[PDB]
């Protein structure tokens, strides 16, 4: 395939609820689009990166940076025989994994689609429909912790995960564990805490969570090593996983026993399909992790998520609960805490033009 | 895709040089060769087991019988999106990765058919030359020894494995070193050893080598860590390689620093490719092992062989080493230390039907 | 002894129940059967391997094969002064262990005889009965599973073994367990586990079980290990345990501190005596396991669990549980918990041959 | 087998030359010799202890209350099915190998010859020639070494054991490996060093000695697997090997590569078995020890070392080099480096009671 010419956008779009961070409560995404072009088809690439780095270091300013001036410039015109082609020409740029994504999930997509297929059965998916589950933050209280969960039950979501932190775990999740003894939940630890904090961590071990996601330091791997040697609960890695190599050396410290697979944090669909292939042989379950991605990332996901080896429901909720109104044609809605995967060749939506330009803060066309 | 109907044969070939084995010396090769039939379309797969298990467990009978009576009624007619679904489809069956191979091998080649493109280009490969090393038995001296491997440089051939076993390795490989100071040679230890012999392989350290081949067990990773820890020279693992679990196993270990990768004996390019993930992961060299394959085989072997983890010379030598007459129609010849991948969708060669009844011992046809 | 014939069968023999597998239901058994003429005698093995490699990876075809062309032509009229010369002489086969196994059996028991001693004298056997245990598959409820441990307790079985599988375990085996706070109960977790699962079965350790039988994957021992050391609970191997220097490694990593024995599995009676020596130095207790076998296998099986380290129940229950007809002329029948050694030089049964005949599917008479 | 009847002796044989120990310079074997009655036939045993407990903890007058008082009484008269039988009762006595070994060595040989068999065979034999290797004793002189090994060699010895401590280790080594570089060489390191001794010992790496044996102290796995991890040539242990057990450790702790099986010191055959199983199992080479045996206790080192396991030569040597006159009417005499395994059921030799009557300094009659 060879890439024709692309166009870059930083679109702005509005949540339909607010939510809290680590500087202040964010109420809009900031979403760096990639259009791919290429024998006359289309392939589409959506960043997760924010304005500000608190997830991870990347930037919405430093990834445009990078795409609109060293990533495609690098490919456009190239003859690349296939997606292993493209992760070449960028490997000389250390780092900035989602800003490679963008790119390099463009063109899986534009790829797929030139092999008339749909993503999921390119990248050796097995499945048409993704289990759901759901994440909520720290609530007021524990009533209020127990009615947010039992609503979220009675919706269908096959998994419950809910935030903790420091003086804010154990009575929290006991309650919860006691008035639903036979839920799925699991806990976001947020990487809030330390080594320190063991007794408080194993004490969670009785109240049988399915895993409890990134503890400690967001780009450690040792410690959580030796925190999972402690526990019977699994630690599930998150931004510790920025690649395969570290997925590699996880697995052989024993730093988590479920990883949460969120493709743009690790470069895309070529370096997602290397861990799917390492934790698989490890015995190690996958589960899809969620950006708060408009139609295009969610597609994406979607896609991906159909692997054999993602055995556990992931953060794949119906785009309505994030969007009054998507950049894609499709509704991606899921029922009864099954999201089917979008039909069609590649990740199967479309994109809804006139709207997409009406949010675009900024463009620009390159051509081969 | 669905596999309409399937032709499997039993052929008789005969080698142009004596193989020495563990039980006897081996003038000819009986291969069981399948052709799968679909969308007009022609997927071939070609088993490297053979008549006795003397390299490992399975034989042309065992491994025909499950093709023909329990694998391809297993999936004749049956829809399969995809080569991973092929792998859903045999799982429950134990083991038996070679007789798995010709099936599943079979089938990436019929689906990359289907979808327009040459084999190497639907599984990752950035290459469409690969480099050729060359393999000796023991000679009767030193003095030979050293005729042989001066011929084969001449040659052009671009890596030496020498086989080696206890009362036969340092003066023979340090006689060879010292004549030719920078040739990358390697041995092939054939299980000829155990832990008892550390001090002979250890004092090959000195002799530079680029790898030692599976000096011990041929189902062993415990043995191999205890030796690799001891020893510089990198040991390279063919045998115990039967699967990624036992890659990722043989990555915790530290038993090994190089992986011989040889299809068939993985149970196919899925499990291939799966290794190969893992490998790369671990930064452990590639190298495209030689089963004394037939056209379809050797064809098979070179576009994997295109990945990008390979990284050393495989034994991927000219067809015209092994067969008087081969049963393509293609040429499969090198040059200067190079093989090239033959083009056109798929592996890219087609069978020479005449010249294969004619070598037919057996052969059945299958339709949906 | 100079082995002068053999006869080798494959006989259909119906099952008085029918069992669910991993590839839909069985309800017959397809038994490789070998009759060893020597001096006059005439030594009986029997194979463990079905139609299918659901178990392990043989199969009847393949074994007949290796034992047919191979194995039987080996050793047909050579002397062999005792077992270990056959095993010496079947060495430059890999693999294939059940094949092997009829053939080390049968020649073993044609050897006591020649020596006119019972089987279990020869093998170094210190008793002659065997105490009984019985395992049952996951039943529809709790209320069932109850009441069938009841039954088998008021039956007078020494140990009950009950299926288990995530989701299924737990609670299943607590019910058990408080409805019966001094029988003695085990779990056949039946390699439906992986790391992923290690706080599902670390929660089983209160319940004092007595062992937890090959919960990971059936070639596994590393993974075995990690497990068995965050366990109380003894883990049991039984799949992967093919061999001696399994048994070996097993003893080095610590992955497992229970070993079920099953002699064709292992390649025969010298193989288990080796494995038995292991396991006795290392204060590792041997049980006898079952693989549904007629009266020959059943014979072979009693004879062997007489060593010392046979110090648990094995299941050696009534034939009369399995086969409304048996083929040879003795009733192996069970009674208070024990099964008695059958009489006689050898194994001490006798060929039902009319019977026989009528299940033969196929035969075939060879000759020195 | 019952045995009917025992009779136990004390001789006294010159040995032809002077034996250094660590208290004294010994000149006459002091032997516990029994002979057992059962069914018309005669089961011979030969003590290895010695007077003063110079080699290990026990003497001829401890071995002697032992027999006479305690293990005959209680096997007098019962029926003993096979040596486990015989194993078993004895059970309760604590350590004590050597004089156990003596009553359970001679039981096997009677149940051999009742059997009808060659010893050898009984035990799982697979050869009847067994390879000799030669001792010497720490010389004057690097010269005197010299000369003495260039004899032995010329003689037809297949291996060389030369005694070395602190301060004559290296360079008598080194001369001799330097005047014959093909030989087979080995050291007795006697207990002679500790771990402060590492540097000389680790030196001794560059000699290619075959083995070093027994360095530290006589009763030590721990130190010796210390000094093995920084050894390229393998430990050879003697003394510390006192049963399975220790063998089953040596093998977790790598506390050696290679094993001097002594019957006896190990308590018999039933034990030495099972070490042979052990190391095999782990690759581990063994070799027949000597303890200056006169012709009962030689055969049976001669049916023992005929076992599959045993890969490098014993201290088998020709009787002539220590008895004028031997016990047993049969010449056990090696030629061009092999020592024949002495033909007959059992271990094949022959009292010669008038020259017994002679050396016997005490005798005591029992039955049952």
Redesign the interface.
């Known amino acids: 395939m060879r890439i024709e010419a692309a166009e870059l956008r930083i679109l702005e779009l509005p949540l339909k609820f607010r939510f809290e961070t680590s500087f202040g409560v964010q109420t809009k995404r900031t979403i760096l689009l990639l259009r791919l072009f290429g024998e006359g088809l289309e392939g589409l690439g959506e960043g997760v990166m924010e304005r500000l780095p608190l997830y991870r270091e990347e930037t919405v300013a430093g990834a445009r940076y990078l795409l609109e001036e060293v990533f495609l410039p690098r490919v456009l015109g190239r003859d690349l025989?296939?997606?292993?082609?493209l992760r070449?020409a960028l490997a000389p740029f250390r780092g900035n994994p989602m800003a490679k994504a963008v790119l390099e999930m463009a063109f899986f997509d534009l790829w797929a689609k030139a092999?008339?297929?749909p993503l999921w059965?390119?990248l050796?998916?097995?499945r048409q429909a993704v289990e759901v589950g759901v994440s909520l933050g720290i609530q007021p209280s524990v009533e209020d912790t127990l009615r947010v969960v039992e609503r979220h039950l009675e919706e269908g979501y096959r998994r419950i995960k809910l935030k903790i932190k420091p003086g804010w775990d154990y009575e929290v999740l006991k309650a919860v564990r006691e008035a639903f003894p036979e839920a799925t939940l699991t806990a976001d630890a947020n990487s809030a805490y330390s080594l320190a904090n063991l007794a408080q961590l194993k004490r969670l071990?009785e109240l049988?969570l399915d895993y409890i996601e990134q503890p400690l330091a967001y780009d450690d791997l040792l410690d959580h090593a030796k925190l999972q040697r402690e526990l019977?609960?699994?630690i599930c890695l998150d931004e510790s996983l920025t690649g395969?190599?570290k997925?590699?050396k996880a697995?052989?410290l024993?730093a988590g026993?479920?990883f949460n697979v969120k493709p743009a944090r690790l470069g895309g669909h070529?370096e997602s399909?290397?861990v799917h292939?390492?934790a698989?042989?490890?015995?190690?379950?996958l589960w899809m992790g969620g950006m708060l991605e408009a139609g295009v990332g969610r597609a994406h996901n979607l896609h991906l998520a159909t692997?054999?080896g993602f055995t556990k429901p992931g953060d794949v909720s119906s785009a309505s609960r994030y969007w009054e109104e998507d950049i894609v044609e499709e509704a991606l809605e899921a029922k009864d805490g099954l999201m089917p995967v979008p039909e069609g060749v590649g990740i199967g939506v479309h994109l809804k033009l006139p709207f997409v330009e009406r949010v675009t803060l900024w463009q620009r066309y390159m051509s081969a």
Chains 1, 2, 3, 4 share one sequence.
């Open positions: 025989p296939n997606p292993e082609a070449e092999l008339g297929r059965q390119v050796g998916g097995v071990d049988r019977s609960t699994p395969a190599e997925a590699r697995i052989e024993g026993r479920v070529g399909l290397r292939a390492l698989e042989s490890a015995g190690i379950p692997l054999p």
